[PDB]
Write a protein that holds these residues in place. Sequence first.
Motif, PDB file in Angstrom:
ATOM      1  N   UNK A 184      46.530  35.008  42.152  1.00 37.72           N
ATOM      2  CA  UNK A 184      45.653  35.093  40.996  1.00 37.72           C
ATOM      3  C   UNK A 184      44.251  34.707  41.451  1.00 37.72           C
ATOM      4  N   UNK A 185      43.277  35.582  41.203  1.00 31.25           N
ATOM      5  CA  UNK A 185      41.883  35.384  41.595  1.00 31.25           C
ATOM      6  C   UNK A 185      41.084  35.022  40.347  1.00 31.25           C
ATOM      7  N   UNK A 193      37.061  34.102  38.531  1.00 26.28           N
ATOM      8  CA  UNK A 193      35.665  34.525  38.601  1.00 26.28           C
ATOM      9  C   UNK A 193      34.830  33.685  39.554  1.00 26.28           C
ATOM     10  N   UNK A 194      35.252  32.474  39.879  1.00 19.77           N
ATOM     11  CA  UNK A 194      34.499  31.679  40.844  1.00 19.77           C
ATOM     12  C   UNK A 194      35.011  31.867  42.254  1.00 19.77           C
ATOM     13  N   UNK A 195      35.891  32.844  42.460  1.00 18.79           N
ATOM     14  CA  UNK A 195      36.323  33.228  43.787  1.00 18.79           C
ATOM     15  C   UNK A 195      37.517  32.478  44.333  1.00 18.79           C
ATOM     16  N   UNK A 196      38.155  31.619  43.538  1.00 19.41           N
ATOM     17  CA  UNK A 196      39.299  30.831  43.974  1.00 19.41           C
ATOM     18  C   UNK A 196      40.585  31.629  43.815  1.00 19.41           C
ATOM     19  N   UNK A 197      41.575  31.297  44.640  1.00 19.24           N
ATOM     20  CA  UNK A 197      42.873  31.968  44.683  1.00 19.24           C
ATOM     21  C   UNK A 197      43.957  30.958  44.354  1.00 19.24           C
ATOM     22  N   UNK A 198      44.803  31.273  43.388  1.00 20.30           N
ATOM     23  CA  UNK A 198      45.986  30.481  43.107  1.00 20.30           C
ATOM     24  C   UNK A 198      47.203  31.314  43.483  1.00 20.30           C
ATOM     25  N   UNK A 204      43.865  32.160  28.699  1.00 16.98           N
ATOM     26  CA  UNK A 204      44.033  32.992  29.875  1.00 16.98           C
ATOM     27  C   UNK A 204      44.028  34.468  29.495  1.00 16.98           C
ATOM     28  N   UNK A 205      43.320  35.274  30.291  1.00 16.69           N
ATOM     29  CA  UNK A 205      43.450  36.723  30.261  1.00 16.69           C
ATOM     30  C   UNK A 205      43.755  37.187  31.668  1.00 16.69           C
ATOM     31  N   UNK A 206      44.887  37.845  31.843  1.00 14.61           N
ATOM     32  CA  UNK A 206      45.234  38.408  33.137  1.00 14.61           C
ATOM     33  C   UNK A 206      44.992  39.912  33.120  1.00 14.61           C
ATOM     34  N   UNK A 207      44.452  40.407  34.224  1.00  9.46           N
ATOM     35  CA  UNK A 207      43.981  41.780  34.344  1.00  9.46           C
ATOM     36  C   UNK A 207      44.484  42.342  35.664  1.00  9.46           C
ATOM     37  N   UNK A 208      44.945  43.588  35.634  1.00  7.60           N
ATOM     38  CA  UNK A 208      45.445  44.239  36.828  1.00  7.60           C
ATOM     39  C   UNK A 208      45.402  45.754  36.670  1.00  7.60           C
ATOM     40  N   UNK A 209      44.943  46.461  37.713  1.00  7.89           N
ATOM     41  CA  UNK A 209      45.077  47.926  37.787  1.00  7.89           C
ATOM     42  C   UNK A 209      44.416  48.599  36.593  1.00  7.89           C
ATOM     43  N   UNK A 210      43.353  47.979  36.097  1.00  6.41           N
ATOM     44  CA  UNK A 210      42.631  48.515  34.963  1.00  6.41           C
ATOM     45  C   UNK A 210      43.297  48.292  33.623  1.00  6.41           C
ATOM     46  N   UNK A 227      42.145  36.634  36.836  1.00  5.59           N
ATOM     47  CA  UNK A 227      42.220  35.706  35.713  1.00  5.59           C
ATOM     48  C   UNK A 227      40.824  35.467  35.153  1.00  5.59           C
ATOM     49  N   UNK A 228      40.655  35.711  33.854  1.00  9.58           N
ATOM     50  CA  UNK A 228      39.413  35.450  33.126  1.00  9.58           C
ATOM     51  C   UNK A 228      39.739  34.453  32.037  1.00  9.58           C
ATOM     52  N   UNK A 229      38.941  33.406  31.927  1.00  8.89           N
ATOM     53  CA  UNK A 229      39.123  32.462  30.837  1.00  8.89           C
ATOM     54  C   UNK A 229      38.272  32.830  29.618  1.00  8.89           C
ATOM     55  N   UNK A 230      38.837  32.569  28.439  1.00  5.33           N
ATOM     56  CA  UNK A 230      38.171  32.777  27.162  1.00  5.33           C
ATOM     57  C   UNK A 230      38.382  31.574  26.250  1.00  5.33           C
ATOM     58  N   UNK A 231      37.369  31.271  25.450  1.00  2.51           N
ATOM     59  CA  UNK A 231      37.477  30.191  24.482  1.00  2.51           C
ATOM     60  C   UNK A 231      37.897  30.680  23.119  1.00  2.51           C
TER      61      UNK A 231
END
Length: 76
Positions: free
Chosen positions: A5-6, A8-13, A41-47, A69-73
Motif C-alpha cells: 500500500x502506497x 501520498x507521502x511516498x511511504x509503503x506499508x 481510508x480510500x483504496x485505489x487500484x487499476x483506475x 491509499x488516500x486519506x479523507x476526513x
Amino acid sequence: MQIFVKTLTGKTITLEVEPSDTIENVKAKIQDKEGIPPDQQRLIFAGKQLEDGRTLSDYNIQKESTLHLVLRLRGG
Ligand SMILES: [Mg+2]
C-alpha cells in the motif's frame, strides 16, 4: 500473500492477505497496523475506487500488487 500500500507521502506499508479477503478486511488490517480508522481510508487500484464488500480477487489484485491509499476526513 504479500501486497503493498502506497501513500501520498511516498511511504509503503506491507500487508499479508489472501485473495478472498474483502476490502473491508484490508482496511481493518491497515487500521490494526497503522491506527487509521477505516472510514478515513480510500483504496485505489487499476483506475477503480475499491469497495468494502468485494474481494481482492474481484479486482484481480495479486501477489506483489500495489494499492494506493488516500486519506479523507469527510465523505464524497
Ligand atoms: Mg501493482
